[PDB]
Amino acid sequence: LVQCILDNTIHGRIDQVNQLLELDHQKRGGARYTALDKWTNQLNSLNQAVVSKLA
Amino acid sequence: NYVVENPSLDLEQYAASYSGLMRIERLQFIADHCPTLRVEALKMALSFVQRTFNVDMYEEIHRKLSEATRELQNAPDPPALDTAWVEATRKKALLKLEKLDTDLKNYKGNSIKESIRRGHDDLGDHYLDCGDLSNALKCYSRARDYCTSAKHVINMCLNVIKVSVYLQNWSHVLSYVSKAESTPEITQAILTKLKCAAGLAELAARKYKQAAKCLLLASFDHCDFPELLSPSNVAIYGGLCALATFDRQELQRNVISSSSFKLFLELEPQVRDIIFKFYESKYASCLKMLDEMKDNLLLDMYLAPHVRTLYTQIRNRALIQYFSPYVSADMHRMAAAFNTTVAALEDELTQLILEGLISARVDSHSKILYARDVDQRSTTFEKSLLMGKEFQRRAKAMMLRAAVLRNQIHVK
């Protein structure tokens, strides 16, 4: 299991205390909010830099 | 700033593998950095430096050996330099050097470019043997002026690299490697030698990624390369740099595809086993053998500070790779994956979290390391609200700035 997870074949992680293998189901299927957040911060900081330079 | 104590270094093999001024420098480094063995190292160094008519470094090594012998005469309670060596060596060296100079300057009156280049290369070799670095550099430069063919350019590059290695002018080494590689349309394997030189120069300049990449392309067919670096140390350097910089998939791909580092790891089975345990999550044995290689190569010509940084990076990467496949890992088990204690592992994990690239939380109650997987939305909303507050605050500030300018407000 460790070798498989190291090879990125398994999208999951191991709980050795309880002899357990927990997989990240990643059923959300999103990652659009990450792009939105990057777009939000980069351009708002871009706007702040432009306003400071223009004044 | 350096110098440690460690036994079990094999002086004979390490001295015989290298040869030339490189061997002299390595023997001097081993003697100066390894006490309780400096006696035999200095004796062998003086025995070999007497060969090929050295002058000043011979005086330094003789003084060091005399001091060491005097030290030996007081602990269990100094050799003569045979100053006739000065006379005979100086006489013979002067005679042959002036004969060669006369021949070369007569050839300069004959005006042949290739002959002048070859004579200047011979003069540079003679000066390097005599212990004249700057003189050899000037001879090799007057040779570089009179180049005719691609092989002449290659020989010039090799000579300049060899000289600047001793001069520690690694910038010249890198420039000449680039010149010898990029120019002539990038059985006789010269590119392997050039890549070895570039890799060693980069490692001496505190570079690990590009140095490892250059070493990976070095084929074992080169075999004999004693003027710069022995194949065993080349394998050690490549393995250490790859372990420190290349992650698991990159490690596997490069080592397998190179097919020459397979042989190199065959020469050095310790590094091969360490890399295999790194891939197979056996970091305890990996790091104990790493400490063994530590004590073994702490007195290497160009390794010590670089290898210390490499080992720090190696242990950090080992911890990062070990915790990565787990969302809730017991710190007892993680500490048992090495000889470290619970407290030291906890401190190292805290330092890694502070630096980053582990993304973890330390539940010190049960000593379990929980990975951090935070929802993007909660972080996104928090920083978006902070941005809006900052935008409003900057909106106020710019709004304020228009006040002092429209109403002409300033210090009189």
UniProtKB/Swiss-Prot annotation, chain A:
It is found in: Cytoplasm; Nucleus. This is COP9 signalosome complex subunit 2. Component of the CSN complex, composed of COPS1/GPS1, COPS2, COPS3, COPS4, COPS5, COPS6, COPS7 (COPS7A or COPS7B), COPS8 and COPS9 isoform 1. In the complex, it probably interacts directly with COPS1, COPS4, COPS5, COPS6 and COPS7 (COPS7A or COPS7B). Specifically interacts with the ligand binding domain of the thyroid receptor (TR). Does not require the presence of thyroid hormone for its interaction. Interacts with CUL1 and CUL2. Interacts with IRF8/ICSBP1 and with nuclear receptors NR2F1 and NR0B1. Interacts with NIF3L1. Coiled coil: none annotated. Belongs to the CSN2 family. Essential component of the COP9 signalosome complex (CSN), a complex involved in various cellular and developmental processes. The CSN complex is an essential regulator of the ubiquitin (Ubl) conjugation pathway by mediating the deneddylation of the cullin subunits of SCF-type E3 ligase complexes, leading to decrease the Ubl ligase activity of SCF-type complexes such as SCF, CSA or DDB2. The complex is also involved in phosphorylation of p53/TP53, c-jun/JUN, IkappaBalpha/NFKBIA, ITPK1 and IRF8/ICSBP, possibly via its association with CK2 and PKD kinases. Phosphorylated by CK2 and PKD kinases.
Swiss-Prot record, chain B:
Widely expressed. InterPro entries: CSN1_C (IPR048624), PCI_dom (IPR000717), Rpn7/CSN1 (IPR019585), Rpn7_N (IPR045135), WH_DNA-bd_sf (IPR036390). SMART domains: PINT (SM00088). One of its GO terms (molecular function) is GTPase inhibitor activity. Residues 214-376 form the PCI domain. GO terms for cellular component: COP9 signalosome; cytoplasm; cytosol; nucleoplasm; nucleus. PROSITE patterns: PCI. GO terms for biological process: JNK cascade; protein deneddylation; protein neddylation; regulation of protein neddylation. The keyword Chloroplast does not apply. It comes from the Eukaryota. It is found in: Cytoplasm; Nucleus. The keyword Metal-binding does not apply. Keywords: Cytoplasm, Nucleus, Phosphoprotein, Signalosome. Essential component of the COP9 signalosome complex (CSN), a complex involved in various cellular and developmental processes. The CSN complex is an essential regulator of the ubiquitin (Ubl) conjugation pathway by mediating the deneddylation of the cullin subunits of SCF-type E3 ligase complexes, leading to decrease the Ubl ligase activity of SCF-type complexes such as SCF, CSA or DDB2. The complex is also involved in phosphorylation of p53/TP53, c-jun/JUN, IkappaBalpha/NFKBIA, ITPK1 and IRF8/ICSBP, possibly via its association with CK2 and PKD kinases. The PCI domain is necessary and sufficient for the interactions with other CSN subunits of the complex. Mediates the interaction with CAPN8. Belongs to the CSN1 family. Component of the CSN complex, composed of COPS1/GPS1, COPS2, COPS3, COPS4, COPS5, COPS6, COPS7 (COPS7A or COPS7B), COPS8 and COPS9 isoform 1. In the complex, it probably interacts directly with COPS2, COPS3, COPS4 and COPS5. Interacts directly with inositol kinase ITPK1. Interacts with CAPN8. Interacts with USP48. Interacts with ASB4; this interaction negatively regulates GPS1. This is COP9 signalosome complex subunit 1. It comes from Homo sapiens.
